[PDB]
Design a protein around this ligand. Sequence first.
Ligand SMILES: CC(=O)SCCNC(=O)CCNC(=O)[C@H](O)C(C)(C)COP(=O)(O)OP(=O)(O)OC[C@H]1O[C@@H](n2cnc3c(N)ncnc32)[C@H](O)[C@@H]1OP(=O)(O)O
Ligand SMILES: Nc1ncnc2c1ncn2[C@@H]1O[C@H](COP(=O)(O)OP(=O)(O)O)[C@@H](O)[C@H]1O
Length: 658
Amino acid sequence: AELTALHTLTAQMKREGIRRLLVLSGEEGWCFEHTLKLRDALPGDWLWISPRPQTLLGREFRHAVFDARHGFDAAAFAALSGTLKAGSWLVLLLPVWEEWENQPDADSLRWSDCPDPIATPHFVQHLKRVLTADNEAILWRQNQPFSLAHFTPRTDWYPATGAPQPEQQQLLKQLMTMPPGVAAVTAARGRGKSALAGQLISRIAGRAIVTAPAKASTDVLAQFAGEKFRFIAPDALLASDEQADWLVVDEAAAIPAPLLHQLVSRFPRTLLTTTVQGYEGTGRGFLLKFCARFPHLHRFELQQPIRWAQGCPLEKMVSEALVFDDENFTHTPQGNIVISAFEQTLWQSDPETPLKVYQLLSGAHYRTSPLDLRRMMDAPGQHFLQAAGENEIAGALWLVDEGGLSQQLSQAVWAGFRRPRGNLVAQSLAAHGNNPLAATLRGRRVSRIAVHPARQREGTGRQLIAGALQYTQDLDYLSVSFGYTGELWRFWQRCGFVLVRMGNHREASSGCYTAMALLPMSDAGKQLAEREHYRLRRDAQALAQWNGETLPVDPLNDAVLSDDDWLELAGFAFAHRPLLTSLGCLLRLLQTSELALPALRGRLQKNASDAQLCTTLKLSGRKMLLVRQREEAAQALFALNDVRTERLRDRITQWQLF
Ligand SMILES: CC(=O)SCCNC(=O)CCNC(=O)[C@H](O)C(C)(C)COP(=O)(O)OP(=O)(O)OC[C@H]1O[C@@H](n2cnc3c(N)ncnc32)[C@H](O)[C@@H]1OP(=O)(O)O
Ligand SMILES: Nc1ncnc2c1ncn2[C@@H]1O[C@H](COP(=O)(O)OP(=O)(O)O)[C@@H](O)[C@H]1O
């Protein structure tokens, strides 16, 4: 009856070149029996995808089941959908419809920073609205009437052979006739960007070098490039002297801009591709700023999906359910900007405002992912501020609660004896700062801040921050962790932030060291910030030398061990403070100490590598090298002042909980 009509609709769907969503909501057993009946009725691959701690290689599947009876992994869901052949069904399993909203989500663990699964009602609420706003999705609920609807047909659709499709062929012509320069092809996932690049390398008379951040499937690109495919990771290409007629970079947005701008000037012609939004995509707002960095950039777009018809209701559902649409970056917010704050409860009563805020926040980031949406919707401790124009959002601020850790735990974190999650900056203040009680303080971290690109540099970004200060109290500080650049820091400095830390680990994506800053609000917060800033000024010279980048603070070259220094050195010597976190102090210890300290001196003063040190000192590896460095620090301290060292060791030793 129902299966027979379902078999007929499938032929139509396959003929129309679309995919569709079939929801099975009911008891687990009931749901499963229906997947059994559905597969033998509609033969196909029926890939099953379910949750726990890939096949999206170039694989395509006919029909699939997504098991969300106990957890909903949004990214996986989105990834699966874009892998289904035309005529495919996406069979989504969900818990009893009336119990869906309050049922814990096993997946929530990956993004809630909670110890146990939490319900995610706002997300479910949103899903139900998309799900029942039209009839495109087939909703099959247990003990509820079921009647396959009848859809007005759409034109016959035909798959791609291998020859470039119309939009590709046209882009291919402009690419092959443009004078020397840079071209960027932007588009939603599945529009044939990687194939276009391969088709290009395949058809030019000259050589071409391709590069990419991680080698994101470069497979499709290689397939169309054929024997002419030549890949070189970004950093090894900058270092090499290799040349080519064309430089082809897909997912160029995920590559550090300074490296990219340098690589491009080496090649007469460059093709940049980047997928916009969706799972693991990049924000449209971010893209605007990215392209702006290439003068005389030729921007091109691709709109037609290649493995399904433009209009597929499955793609529309996923885009709506996960908020991948970004048309707002097209319109310019008008008039006076008005700042206001709101809480996560607004999802339930007025979802359009947090929806629009997410659009802007998501569109301004270099990476887009439904993990963020899940977090904003149901994780606890999230708070928002918005900057509204007459009929559109001009800016938004996303804050998250942090700190309030017990004295005992903070100390444990400081010593590095314990490192649980959540409280990113709070814990970092302790683990990388001088105050073992830094994590007991309360504040809110700036998770994301974004201003519409047509409304930047008018003060809305600073007014957003002013609003956060305005609408909240009983907080020790506002904090922010960001990839460092002089421009971005200057913005935070304006907003009143105080730099308290500069990392030593360049972010793979941005290529920047991570900086941390604080906008203090209580006398305790003010002291943490000044104290930490003073410490950074004493470590500036050592940091700049190690990082290869000067820090923007007045350096204090006073090499004299302080009480502050002794505490940290003891933490390094008798606990688990990281070597680099103790860089400034260790260097000051080494300047005063008369001891050989080969492991510390070799690494910090003579540019020896870990491998070389291990061989010269005959250690088994990095682990023992570090243990030896801690023992050397202890010796140096004892050789300077035995009793002070013993008291410090005794004190920090006890901070180990359990
Ligand atoms: C994790 C964290 O969220 S990290 C940081 C990331 N978010 C951003 O990547 C998105 C990209 N950028 C934007 O959307 C922006 O340019 C924002 C957040 C960084 C700033 O907002 P804007 O509205 O342009 O800020 P605003 O105009 O209020 O800047 C105000 C103060 O900062 C200065 N400033 C602002 N932008 C910049 C910039 N790009 N370079 C240098 N200085 C700047 C100011 O002019 C002003 O001080 P002033 O009174 O002397 O003029
Ligand atoms: N002209 C074409 N002919 C045949 N298959 C194609 C063609 N263009 C793209 N494809 C295939 O369709 C899909 C789109 O891949 P892709 O080009 O990498 O789009 P995107 O870069 O936006 O993710 C892949 O499975 C690819 O192999």
